[PDB]
């Protein structure tokens, strides 16, 4: 009934991934703003980046108008979040 998708998140300024699920239901903005809370980024300085559960990189998300589920996000798909403020992307 309700659509969960498990991820696998890493960041740039964290060095360490951490599995969790989340509901597919919810859109982006909600998922991000569960990042902004541990990392301590803002929604534009955010930016997403997600990787297919295959390795390769899709593209970039960013879009929150949606579900989850609606974007394609699915399960076993690793989301990167970079933040962009303070220049970090390597």
């Known amino acids: 009934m309700t659509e969960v998708y498990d991820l696998e998140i890493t960041t740039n300024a964290t060095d360490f991934p951490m599995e969790k699920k989340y509901p597919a239901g919810m859109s982006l903005n ?3 703003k569960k990042l902004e809370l541990v990392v301590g980024t803002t929604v534009d300085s955010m930016r997403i980046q997600l990787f ?3 390795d390769q990189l899709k593209g970039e998300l960013t879009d929150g108008a949606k579900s989850l589920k609606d974007l394609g996000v699915r399960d076993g798909y690793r989301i990167h979040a970079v933040d962009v403020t303070g220049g970090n992307e390597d």
């Open 30 to 32: 909600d998922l991000k």
């Open 52 to 54: 297919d559960g295959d």
